[PDB]
Write a protein that binds this ligand. Sequence first.
Ligand SMILES: N#Cc1c(N)n(Cc2ccccc2)c2ccc(Oc3ccc(NC(=O)CN)cc3)cc12
Ligand SMILES: N#Cc1c(N)n(Cc2ccccc2)c2ccc(Oc3ccc(NC(=O)CN)cc3)cc12
Ligand SMILES: O=P(O)(O)OC[C@H]1O[C@](O)(CO)[C@@H](O)[C@@H]1O
Ligand SMILES: O=P(O)(O)OC[C@H]1O[C@](O)(CO)[C@@H](O)[C@@H]1O
Lengths: 439, 439
Amino acid sequence: PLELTQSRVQKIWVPVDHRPSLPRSNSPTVIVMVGLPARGKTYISKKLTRYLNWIGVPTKVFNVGEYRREAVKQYSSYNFFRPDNEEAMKVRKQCALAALRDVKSYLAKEGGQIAVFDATNTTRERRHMILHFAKENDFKAFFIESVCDDPTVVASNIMEVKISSPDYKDCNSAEAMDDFMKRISCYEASYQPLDPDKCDRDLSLIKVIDVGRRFLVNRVQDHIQSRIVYYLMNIHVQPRTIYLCRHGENEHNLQGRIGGDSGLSSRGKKFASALSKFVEEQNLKDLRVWTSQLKSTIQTAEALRLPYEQWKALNEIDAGVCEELTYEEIRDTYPEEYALREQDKYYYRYPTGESYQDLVQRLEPVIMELERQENVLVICHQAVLRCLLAYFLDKSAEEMPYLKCPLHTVLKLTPVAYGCRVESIYLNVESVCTHRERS
Amino acid sequence: PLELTQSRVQKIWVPVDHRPSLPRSNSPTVIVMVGLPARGKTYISKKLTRYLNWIGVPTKVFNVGEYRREAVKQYSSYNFFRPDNEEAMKVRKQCALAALRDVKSYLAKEGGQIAVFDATNTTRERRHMILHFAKENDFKAFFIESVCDDPTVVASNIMEVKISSPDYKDCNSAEAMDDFMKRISCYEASYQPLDPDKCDRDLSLIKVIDVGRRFLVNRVQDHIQSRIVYYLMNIHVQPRTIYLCRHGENEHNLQGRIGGDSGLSSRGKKFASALSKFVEEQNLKDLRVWTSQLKSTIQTAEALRLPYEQWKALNEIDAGVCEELTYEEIRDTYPEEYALREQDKYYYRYPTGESYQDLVQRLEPVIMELERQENVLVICHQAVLRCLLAYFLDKSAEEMPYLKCPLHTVLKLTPVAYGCRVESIYLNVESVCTHRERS
Ligand SMILES: N#Cc1c(N)n(Cc2ccccc2)c2ccc(Oc3ccc(NC(=O)CN)cc3)cc12
Ligand SMILES: N#Cc1c(N)n(Cc2ccccc2)c2ccc(Oc3ccc(NC(=O)CN)cc3)cc12
Ligand SMILES: O=P(O)(O)OC[C@H]1O[C@](O)(CO)[C@@H](O)[C@@H]1O
Ligand SMILES: O=P(O)(O)OC[C@H]1O[C@](O)(CO)[C@@H](O)[C@@H]1O
């Protein structure tokens, strides 16, 4: 009794499945965005979706405006958003219902876990309809409202991401700004904010007040909602830069050996000096420096003459029994293991070691702290860097083990208009190449 | 250049410190509890302190009532708490100032990081005085207010932990309840709740409303405050049971070998059956079962015929190079390593392996999820179990590696009146002993 087998790829112990002659084969969530236009609802939707997908929760944004741009060919003006525009009001409702139809298909038929319903959802009527849709489909509903009265914040959002919208292609900055202000005004009369005190007392919600200065949290039901709330409380919209790089070339790199805790080669030491000059030239008022607990990243940070913090979570992927071996020695000693990894690089777990999937779980606290911080330099390792980069660049689990993260190269990340601007800076020091493409 | 040495105990790479001829050698936080008596302030203080200490943040509670019980020998009645009691009002202020004096000494001179100031702090005047004390000593201030108007909740708190207070030793349940209600009334007139809208807008605070049904979060400044907020949102006061046990005896246990991924011995399989009978006899409506990804815990869970979830975070401490070795083989092959561990069992890191300190960091998400859940059975390993037990039993880092966690024994944890009631249930199946006392 209790016969188990270890799955070849993930190394998970499962009950031996001696299928008979005829082999026979929790609740999803609708995140409801709430608020007036230019309140960062799309910014929240996109960032939260990026984080949830990276941690392994399949998430998708359903933006009602995109359904509208598809149904109504060319956008002319705020007149489309008028409350007295009978025809456009019918079209807008149809677009919201078509988005909900795609929400049902995503959560009930496509293996999606979270659907972010990105719309104004400013009226109790619209929200009651979304709740009815959730209850009838056995979906949980979690509301995220963004409340802000600052005209500087509103004007800045219009200038940064609204004027550049496909709706304002034929318009100049002044026309687009004026039209958008009138467009916001169309929503102000019927806007009923969330009321957790009386009306929305039984709803699970978060009210993000004054661009995250204050929060009203009501009835957090589960793990995922609690995580979202913690995430929203850790992120900020302050300007900053994230620099990511690997340790300078090490002795194992020269021998083509994986893992281990070898020190910097002569070229690696040259990169470390080059990195110090680069850091100095960036003229950053304050900079946090993070390393792994492995020698090569610490030696690189030592060259900076700056305080640094060592994180065990930043240590390179653990290769288990394959540690300190070359890829040729892995193919010759463990050919089955080598081929299994090549076929499923993200989920593959090394024997007594890790997978890229395990790395994500380990790096989640790193990501949360990266979000809290401002200027940060992370000196790490190839697999760790691919994982962090997949988070910032919204790369899938399938692409993550193949992202190009060369040695002696700084990846400069600048958060701007929904995404991250990525600049690469090679510090002109030769090294070996450790990148291996798929087969 | 960049000469580093690896510290023998923790295995941390540090710059080689060639001290010259004459060798030369962030801000603490005051957590302010706010609210009327019988609002769970002491419950919050104690639980939060237990969590913060376990994760490695030195934390201490300063309860003003304990300073009062020390200054004023015997407690007679609510008359001591009267606003017109000039003498007792002076004494109570002196007690609060004496507690603050000990807060300053703890944070500035004893290496304490967090001081939980456990008092009513119901008036703006008292809170302004605490803020002045924090600003002058360069301490951060974070307010935690508990607001509840439910008379059932208040009466239940008086019955559960107030009537049994050293103040009510000579009183019967009815006298003590009546005196305590009058005592609460003494505070109601001068009570000024936190106002993050106008008056307390610049204060860093959390308002816990209706026993954690709702939260008002204002100006979370840093990492530790964000963590506290996340913790408060994950804990609950619902009745439940936590069962903790190790996998049934394995083949490595019989050989006296550490680590590895061996399967259950014949006795281990007998324990697994005994555990199923025990679980069945507990008659729990719902029960979550958690295991590690190691075979022995999964085989134990397989005997239950219940759904279970495997956590890589529950995997036994990694012994690095010492994996699959007996303690005799460790002492003979690695005598320096063996002696270093015996001297500093909590901080000692195995080469390419872990410390109990690393285990805590790995187990933090397990603890957070254990808090969210109700009835949970955790089937794990000796070092993992000691770490989890140290959290629930408020054991120090020094005691943690020596806690007794025998094989074939269930530790039944029942949360009641500030602590955890611990019941041990041996399932009458023989095994080897893996416990090793200090030398
Ligand atoms: N109202 C409004 C908002 C707005 N205009 N934006 C766009 C924006 C982009 C880049 C820079 C500034 C604003 C936002 C971007 C995000 C946003 O929601 C937030 C903002 C901040 C937090 N949390 C915190 O800041 C707590 N440390 C959580 C959610 C609100 C707005
Ligand atoms: N008012 C009041 C409270 C009160 N009487 N107690 C004592 C208590 C002990 C055991 C059982 C029930 C209540 C409390 C114990 C804790 C407490 O503060 C909480 C309560 C709940 C949370 N969070 C959540 O429940 C969110 N899942 C965070 C903090 C408030 C009270
Ligand atoms: O997943 P991949 O492509 O093998 O890359 C990860 C490897 O890269 C290295 O960082 C350097 O080759 C190794 O230490 C690690 O095993
Ligand atoms: O810290 P200690 O006392 O060595 O106990 C941890 C050890 O106990 C075991 O779980 C069983 O002996 C080992 O796998 C592990 O190395």
